[PDB]
Each structure stands twice: as structure tokens, then as C-alpha cells.
């Protein structure tokens, strides 16, 4: 009777089906990057953005809607509950309390730890099954928290880490030999903020033994100018926010870069926050970031890398920072 | 003690996995390039390659294998046998007897049915769900054959019908106006091969009513030159081989094209072949080319189109040549 | 002496070079999510972004910067001035005075003119042969102001007009027979805001006398709601702002749908503003927007499509409003 | 008059354009993949095909060309001479000798260099300030004759070298950790065929320094099976062909990966081949391949390695034999 019921024929039995999603929570200039990037790319034919300021959200979400022409994704959908994640493959938590001239630090913790108690668990019971990549921030800690507060296997929970900054790091250091992030390659972990251990013991620009960049050493640490990019990439998070009044893009790239990974089962090695519950001489439920391997089924497997007496020192240290911070509850 | 059991650390449960594949069952040219081109997106993480030819498929496979470092497809495999199909999400079917300058017609058919009755069922027995994008030529009565022979719902068996043809055509069409094949459109149905009445009726380069080819009318069929584009069309299948000495690139592009949208989900209509079995007239288990709605789950539904008087007659015909052909078994 | 020194080595004569840039005037939201993405595609390698509130900027450019390990643009530059932007091949403006519920309207016009007056000319000075996209608002009357304040030939001088409203409303129209908006066609023309004439003359899901949405008509205008899919479009430009309070994703999508046009030489027709100034009735350097086609060098044609008596009615009818508006300068 | 003249508007003064374009001289499968390729990706919008086996070239060329909808490459064209080449920006020669199961070594040699004196040179009178990638064979000992026949700077006449064998290497190297090639690191140089030199002393799955495969050494040269990653990735070029008869698809993802990089300014460091006329001990115009960094204008600088006492032993070695073969001209 209708242009329906007359231009479109319904081959009928099996006319409805699903399987496999990608979830924000909280659209927040982050949530969002990490948003739309998703979306430049085929990560997720059903992307469900989850936030709890239905306001923006249903403008937002309506945004990327009026944008389906261009989009690889035919649905996104939005909810002011977990309900609208049923089945996700992977869920992004990105909703907490963000940033501030001066505040950041861990201090946006006690802080967040609440906003999990709430926003993590609850959103799980929905996809049992799901992946999680917390963004917040305090990534480390909040790892922790989400980790202990859903209960799943980590290889499943998963977080931020240093990726970023790993990627900030191969970003400055190139800027110096005139040479692509790519291919240069430099190793940053510890904590994610500003506990960060780079790792010049592994270096290179070519190959290690080959070009690693202690041979030439014009140091690298015990002087002559690059422990700088170190302290370039720390302070480097910081200055950003004071400018643009926050933390976006950057962000939402990395993130991506481990959904893709995850995603299309890459079994591309990552530097990420895990349980270094007991790896050198860390020993005790510690999550801080260390190289890993991320596929299908999360963290398959971990990189021990070669940390000079200290480097396993300043580790052994924020592992620890890290660490009575753990002393933990609501309390 | 090994490097393996120094370098890399196994996280404990779950390290091992399974899920969304895509199969080729042969590699002739055409299976080959709808190869590589599946590859030159990220339609799929597992893609294995069944032929026969064990030789050339070990050659062949090993070479996109040793083409590793640029693919976003970490498994490759291949098989001697079809167990190597097992939970495959998308089976395309292009093994039979391919193309001579002269012969090409429904020829390679009887001949066909054979390399089916064989091949095809016994592939679905490993991935019983699977969905098959039927490429070889005869892909009407193939997809007829294969339809039977399999016996899950048309939706899951699909033929590359004339994607492949109304896409040659739109080229063509655009070759004259000078804007974009996207950007021209026009549909060529019935047969794959030289029972295709495009359909002019329909015909834009802007809208329907809009800019449709016919109210400015050079004709379009009823004179004044433009049945060459069709004439051009058909012709040019026949050219192509007569020069190459076959049909490669363009018919994988083609298909990539059906996965594309099968895989994402994309809902994006096509012209394909299933069951006109009761439709505009055809009322026998003739299967030939319309434009259909393709998603995660086959076929959803079908559109039906307004060819005028005739452009119902040619297709009535079709169907019908199509159809005794069909008094099949290997009788 | 140094690591440079030792382990790059500089191959003589020619070391130095440059070519084919984006640049893009002001990071407002838009400014920026039409950055971003011209990044998540390979249009540009090097994107140089002059805004003139330095402070986001060098904060904005550099989240970009350090988010390098990602790009495949190795150079994004960032100016106070236009100095900054020698030698683009593709200029976007999108700097002036953005929204306000309710406001909205051509309202930030006497405003924007102004906003250009200064911005644009000057940007010109320094690529001379450059080719615009002005997405400001008000793109009409704002392309004219280009136009004019410019002085190179439209084709350089273009519009974001109506590509996004007539993408606006594929969405929509898609979303009522459950097919890609990439799969529906409609064109909705004469003004970005509210003067908008949609042509459903022309609107298929699959071909122009073949399936026009006309012929089965369950009206389209004259009734029987479809209307409202129109009134949808235009009301849904207003919907999202009132509740992000602002327009970014879609309309940086949409542009970057522009470039990758004008830069690949695509010749992809499409709905941009430009010089009406002699068609179906208008004489007078109005500029609203209509089916064109775009390559390398600009508009190269346009498209004079078949409105219904009326149909040029209401475009006659646009065309005019925003004519006396044009009675312009300063004064 | 016609739909033509009645359908698209002509908008005056500029209707023509020409700039960046991509060629490949001959289409053996090679010269083809490393053709489709090219088009499975956005590096050209002018891709001219040259071959002088003018039949199976516009079959081949029409496939392509036919294959339209789908490219983001409006222009496909092909010549039987170079003049229709005229301004390409990378011209990439893929002619003469290919393979045969035993023959394969630098016997495609004085065979080739004869396909070259014609061939190459006179390609260059039309592109004048081309740039040339040599994927021909003999790479090496024929980037040499192009070098010398063409006479314009190294820089813009490169080859294949290894990036291709590297790559084989990253393979199974990663084959065995269970890790990406992309994340594992190792570099072979020297000559491209049987005279490989990896170069152990730097290859890396984190850092050099770092994870430097060296120092968990299970040896790598000195015994405990890795030599055989490079006795596979040798052998394992010839292995291929004995099987499908020739060496394809992965020769050109290679290239493509070469061309993405020259285009897109990637200033991404690659093992390509060049005048290592004075670098570790040679000393005598000898190109073999190094890794060195590729840009818009060719190699920009090279890369200096730390080759153990012998792996500049070896590569000293190559070079030379590389040499003598180099007392040339059609003598």
C-alpha cells in the first residue's frame, strides 16, 4: 500500500541479527576523539556511546547520525544506561573528572575511583564478555580499580598506559634526527604521567646492537642533551592542557591504535598497564605499563625487557609510588 | 632457557582464540585477485584458500604469506581439503573451467554443474552458517546449482550477478558525460552475460524524475545512440578476455565490493542474483540478477524495480532462457 | 662528532624541497574536525592551520604534533599570519562568530563579512592560485563576499552550501526504508538554512524513471509525509546545536568530502555554492548552491537540473532573499 | 542540442588541467601488481601504463579502466611509447627477463641491461625531473645502467634492493616469536639475491640496547638455528616460483610501500639500493642496497650502519662481486 510495502521486498525468514560492537563511556572531548577516529577507520559496524549527561549526548551522538553518509558503521546508538551496550566487544571507558592547570596529577583519583564504582560494573553485566581499555587516567590505578571492581581476567582489562607517551617520545625524538616516529622507536614506561622511566637502553634507528642509540652514545641520561626529550615528553602532557584546556586528539589516536590492534587480532606488541604483580622485583597487585602483546583475547602475552640496574630501579619505583596509593576502598 | 622462554611471557589462561574468516575456493586469476583486494582492506583476519592445484596454491599463498608486513590480516592459510574452511563467515567460489576467446557463453556449464556437485556442498558441511558469494559464471545457474545443491536459504547463497556488468556500464556511461561512475548511475539486470537488459527507465546523473537520462531523451534504446553503451557493455566482457586472455582485476573488485557490505553491515543495495522464483511475472525456480539489500545475514530483501512493458518482457525473457537450462541433475 | 653527525648522512645537493598543502583558517570545533579528518585520509602532507587566538592554537597544532605516530602527513605547520600558509593548493575558512540558540540565522553575517574582510584577502596574497572552501555560514553571502573581496574565478572560490544538508537528509531518508543513505538519493538545494528546496523532482533508490521516490508517491510534498523529512533537515541543522551548542563532526566530514574530490581530480558532481547568477531565471550575481562538478582546477561545470514549475519557484524565490541581502559593503 | 549540451554547464575559462602521476613500464604480473596496488590506495590520480606487448596492455589496461567504480584514480592511461608518460613524478620499470625455475641468479643480466638501453632512457626525455624506482632485478647491477644510462642524481633513481627481502625476513623472524613483522625489527643488506647480509647485530622486538635479539643471544650467526631465518628468506625467493611460476604480488606491495613514501613525504628510512661508492671500504661506483631515508625529492641521506667487523666483511664482499659484473657497456 506504501512507497514501503511497494519499493522494498522483505526476503523473508532472518530479517533481523548482531554480534559485534565498540562502546564510549562519556563523550567527553576524549570519549569523542576517540569517537569519531574509531569511525576513520572500520573498527565497528555498531558503535554505542554510553553517557550520563543525556544532554550533549543526544546532540553529539546525533551529530555523528546526521554523518552517516561517509561513516563504514551503519549503527550508533546512545544510552543513558549500560543497557545500550548489550554484546560490545570492547567497551572505553572515558568518563571521570578531567584535567586542570596545575591539579593534574593523581589527583583526580579518590575522585574517580567513585565514578568506576558506579560507571564500570554494571556496564559489564551487560557484556560479560567484553574487553575493557580505560582511558581515565590514573589509567594505572583505575586499571586496578576497574580490574578488582568488575573481576575479570586482565588480558580483558586493559588501560592508556604509555602508548601515548611512548608515542609522544618517538614524535620528539624524530624531531631531532629528521627521521618519521615510525621509524625511529623508544620505549617509555613506568607510570603514566610523571614517574616515567623512558627506556634508552633500547634505542634504535635502524637495529638493536645495530642502531641503538647508545653506541653513539652522545649520552642519552648521564648527560650531553636527551634525557630533555624525556623531560620533554613528561612536562609535554602538561603543557597541552594549560593551551588548549585539555587533552583530546592525541588521546583518541592511541586508543584506536589499540583497538585496531585488538580488533583485527594484530598480536601487535603494545606498551599498556597490566598486573606487574611480580615481574622484576615488583611484587604485589601493582598495575603500571609494560610492553605486551594485544590480540583477539586481549593480553596474550608480556615483554620483559632488559632494564639497566636502575631502569629496573626507577620502575621498582613507581611500581611502589603506584603502590601504597592501592591501599584502597571507599574508606 | 630459549630466547621464546626469555623474551616474550605467555599470560597464563586464554591464549588462544577463534572467530571471522574469509575463504577462496580457488585461486585461478579471478579467485587471486578477489584475493588480494580482499587484503587491500580489512575485510578479514583469518582469510584461508582452498584449491586443488596444491601446487600453485602453496606458491601463491606463501607469496601473500611472505607479504605479511603490510597486510592488516595476520592468518593466511590454505588447504588441500575444505577443512581448512572450518567457521569461515564468507565462502566465494571461483573453481570450474574459466574462459576462452570464442567459447565463453553458458558453456562452461554442464561442465560446471560437475566442478560444483564436487567443491561446493562438503565446503558448507565444515562451515555449516557460512555465506557464499558464488564468482564462476553460470553464476546465475550456478548460484541455482549451488542453491540446490547446498540447500541453506538464498540470502546466505549469492551471486556476483551483475554488479560487476551495471558498474562496467556506469563507466561506460560516465565515459561520455565526464563525471564519475559514482556519480552517474544506471542498472544493467537479467543476465550476466548477453541476455542483459540494463534499465534505462532509471537512469540519473542527479535524481529520479530529476536528472533521469530519459527527459531529455537522445533516446536511450528507441534510437540515437546509447544501446552502444550497452552494446559496448556485453561486447566488453568478451573484448577484455580476447586480449589478457581473461577476466581478473575487475570481477574481484566486484565481489570485494558484496563482501564490503556483507561483512560491515552496510544494508547497501545491490544488483545480484536469487530467486526471481515468483516475481514480475517468472514463476520457476529461475534465479537471475536484481537489485537487493545486503547485509551481515545475505539477502534481507529485494527491490522491486519499474522496467516498462518490456524492460519486464527482456527480463521475462531471461529468466525463461535461464530457465529449461535449468531441467537439471548430471543426466 | 654527533649522533647526527654519525648516524644520518646527508646525500648532497638537494635536501630541501616542497609542493601541495591543505591549510585551514581557525580551530573553532569546526575548523578543527575538518582538521582531524583531512588528517584520517591522505590528502595532505603538510596542513598548515592559521588561527589568530595564538594561544589554543599552538596548543590545538600541537596535540596534533605529537600525535604524529599516526598521520601520513609528515608536516603540520601553524601561523599568526598567512605567511604561514605559502603555497596551498586548498584554503578553508572557517573563522567569524559560531552559533547561538536561537541566533542562528544569516545573522552572523554583517559580523562575518567584517571577520573576512580582514581574514581572507591577505590569505590570498600569499597563494595566489589557490582554490577556497568557505564553510563559515552565510557561506552563501560569505562566498560572494570571497568572491568578491578575492577576485579570482568562482571555481576557485567555492561553498560549502548544501552538501551537507542534502547528506543531512540522504540520512534521514534512509532511515525510513532501511537503506544507505549512500543507496537513497535527493538533492536539496537554493540555501544552507531555511530557504532550502529540496528537488524531490529527482529522488531515486536505484534510478530516475526507474525508481524516482515520484512514482509510487505516496506524495513527496503535496502531502503524505515526506515533508517532514525536509522539515526535519532544515530543523535538524538548529536540534543539534541547542544541544552540543555547536556544529562540528558533519560539517567537517562533509568538507574534507570536498577536498578529497577537488584533490584527486574526482570529477564527483556535487552541491556546493556558486554563481547562479544567470540560471532558471535568477540575473543577479547571487550565489546559492547547486549540482556541480569538481576536479583539480575548481568547478569545472555545473549541473541545471529539472525543477518543477515551482521547484524554480522557490529557487527564484531563495535566490532573491539572499540577493538584496548582497547589497553590500562595510557601509 | 544534446543531452550533453543540455544535462552539465561548461563554467568557462579553465576546462583542463595535468600534475602528479605514477607509470609503470610493463605489466608482467609484477609490473601489474605493483599496478593494482598502486590503486588500492590514493598515491595516484594519473597512473599511465607503458608496455610494448600492445596487446595484452589495453586488455589489461581496459580490465583496470573497466574496473572504475572503485579507484580514486579518475585516470587510467597507456601508451606503446613513452610520450605517454609526459610528467609523471615516479616512473617504475618492470621489464625484461622474468624467472625460470634454476636460471634466476644475475643471469637476467646482460639480457636486461639491452632492455634497458632502450627501455629506460627516452622515458626520462618525456618526465625529465621523474623519479625512478627499479624493480626489474639485477636491481642492483641495473640501477647501476639506469644510473649511468639515464644520468640524473641517485636520489632520483632508486631500487627495489631489499625493503622486499627485509620484509621476507620481519616475516618469518616474527614467524617464530609469535609477534608482527611490523614489531619485530631486523635489517639484510648487501646485494638482493644470495649475497644477503642480514645484519644481526641489530634486530630488535622492543629496543636496541633494549630488546636487541643479541643478548639473550640462543646465538644468531655463531650457531643455534636463526641463520636459517636467513638460509628460508634466500631460498625463499626461488621457492615461490619453482611453485606459481614467477614472483608477484608481495615484489609490488613492496614498492607501493616505497612509492607511499617518496609521495607522501613519509621521510620513512628504507633498505633501498644506491652509490655505496665510498661507504664502509667500498670504493668503487657500486650500488647495493642501504637503509636510507626516502622523501618527495628521492633519497635525502643515508644510513650508517654498525656492520660487525665481518658484516662489513660480507658487505664489503658483495659489493665487489656486485663490482667486477659492473665492467660494462653492450661489449
Known sequence: ????????????????????????????????????????????????????????????????????????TPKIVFGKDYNVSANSKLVIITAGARMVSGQTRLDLLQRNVAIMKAIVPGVIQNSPDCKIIVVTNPVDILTY???????????????????????????????????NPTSCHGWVLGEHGDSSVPIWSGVNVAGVTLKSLNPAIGTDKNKQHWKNVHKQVVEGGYEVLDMKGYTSWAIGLSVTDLARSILKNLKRVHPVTTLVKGFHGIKEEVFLSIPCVLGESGITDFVKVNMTAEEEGLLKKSADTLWNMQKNLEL
Chains 1, 2, 3, 4 share one sequence.
Open 1 to 72: 500500500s506504501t512507497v514501503k510495502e511497494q519499493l522494498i521486498q522483505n526476503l523473508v525468514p532472518e530479517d533481523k541479527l548482531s554480534r559485534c560492537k565498540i562502546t564510549v563511556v562519556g563523550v567527553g572531548d576524549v570519549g569523542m576523539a576517540c569517537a569519531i577516529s574509531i569511525l576513520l577507520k572500520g573498527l565497528a559496524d555498531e558503535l554505542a556511546l554510553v553517557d550520563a549527561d543525556t544532554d550533549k549526548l543526544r546532540g553529539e551522538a546525533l551529530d555523528l547520525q546526521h554523518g552517516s553518509l561517509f561513516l563504514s
Open 145 to 179: 580499580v576497574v580490574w578488582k571492581i568488575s573481576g575479570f581476567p586482565v588480558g580483558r582489562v586493559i588501560g592508556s598506559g604509555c602508548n601515548l607517551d611512548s608515542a609522544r617520545f618517538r614524535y620528539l625524538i624524530g624531531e631531532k634526527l629528521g627521521v
